[PDB]
Amino acid sequence: SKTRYYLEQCIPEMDDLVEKGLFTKNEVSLIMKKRTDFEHRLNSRGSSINDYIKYINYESNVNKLRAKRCKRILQVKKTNSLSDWSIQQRIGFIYQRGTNKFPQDLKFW
Amino acid sequence: NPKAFPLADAALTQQILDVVQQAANLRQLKKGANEATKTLNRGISEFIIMAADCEPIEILLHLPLLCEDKNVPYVFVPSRVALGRACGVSRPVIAASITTNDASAIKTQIYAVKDKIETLL
């Protein structure tokens, strides 16, 4: 299935969060559970563009939470590791999938 | 571009009129536009001959519409005076038809003309 391939792409990110201590393992699991439902929704039949917008919004919110726990816990503006740029790259990847699937919707473009 | 089309040249016209004269002797000729329409409707017409000088020409331009629908060869000859003479009647004839008959004595001559008309069209 396509879904599992996309989920495993997240693992190196979730590993970095625990190692940096920003998120606990239980918290990290909850993020993956929400992604698992999203990443599945996109690849299954009946998907609409709104599913892409929801997932993009969710990933954007996770980026904010990481950015604040960085200064709160690590006390560093940018942690030099994979976690810094994974989300921003992922959100871009979601857009490229969305526009290919639904080139009609001008709002998404 | 002209309404009367195709118009047979001199050499072909001589051969067409010859067949008409032979057909008239054998009772295989229907003379006049009204008869010609009746033959096409009954689909017994080997081919139709028309006078390109018919005055006015439109009076017989209904036959091609019948001819093309039913897939019957047709041709225009320059003279109505000559066509009437070959037909054997004592008046001008603007349209004539060769009735279908596979038992005819002039079958080979008819088909010889029929191919040439088909090439012209």
Binding site: - | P64, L65, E68, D69, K70, N71, Y111
Partner: protein, 241 residues
């Protein structure tokens, strides 16, 4: 036989979109798409249904070759309600209009004609029948009217030309759906008058095989016509074996 006031018991035919009117004599009929008029002066039958007045058109076998095919008993006609059909060599609405009746409002008929004079009556008929798209073009160059035609479930060829095997093939490749229908009416005199009618029919059948059209059936149209046979075939691109 079928006089003006005479009345008939109309019951359906084995082929969908074809009906039989019984009586002292039997008539093949198809339901009128545009009630209240006749395109070539055929007889018409009116039935009162709950009450709306529907109208049936009498199909004369002697004028339309396809009709003569029904009466002789063609096993399979790919023309049926709700199917796109391409009619090549539509001289006028004598036979296309009947085909349009069979397909019904849902289906469409692509009538193709070359000569302008019979076409003018084709166009005037087409206005009364929305489901007919008349294409005044030469069937020998299908590329010219490719914009106008989509996939067509069946291709019906009444064209009287010596080289039929090419026109039917070229339009078959471009527009016929795989496993689609092909119905060709063959006139022995037109293709080659020098040889007997049987040889011509055998020759045309072989051409269709070379063009990947597996031929299913041949029927001779007598007594309705002399030296005519309708060959029904399927377009099998996968394999004709």
């Amino acid at each position: 036989g079928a006089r003006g006031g005479a009345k008939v018991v109309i019951e359906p035919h084995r082929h969908a979109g074809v009906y039989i009117a019984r009586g002292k004599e039997d008539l093949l009929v198809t339901k009128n798409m545009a009630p209240g008029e006749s395109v070539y002066g055929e007889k018409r039958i009116s039935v009162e249904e709950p009450p709306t007045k529907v109208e049936y058109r009498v199909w004369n076998p002697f004028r339309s070759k396809l009709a003569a095919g029904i009466m002789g008993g063609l096993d399979e006609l790919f023309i049926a309600p709700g199917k796109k059909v391409l009619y090549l060599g539509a001289a006028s609405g004598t036979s296309v209009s009947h085909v349009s009746d069979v397909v019904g409002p849902e289906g469409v008929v692509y009538a193709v004609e070359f000569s302008h004079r019979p076409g003018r009556e084709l166009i005037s008929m087409a206005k009364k029948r929305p489901n007919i798209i008349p294409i005044i073009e030469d069937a020998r160059h299908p590329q010219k009217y490719r914009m106008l035609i989509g996939m067509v479930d069946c291709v019906f060829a009444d064209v009287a030309q010596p080289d039929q095997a090419r026109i039917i093939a070229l339009n078959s490749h471009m527009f016929l759906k795989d496993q689609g229908g092909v119905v060709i009416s063959i006139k022995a005199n037109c293709i080659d008058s020098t040889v007997d009618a049987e040889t011509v029919f055998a020759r045309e059948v072989q051409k269709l095989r070379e063009e990947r059209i597996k031929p299913l059936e041949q029927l001779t149209l007598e007594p309705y016509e002399r030296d005519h046979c309708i060959v029904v075939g399927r377009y099998m691109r996968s394999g004709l074996k």
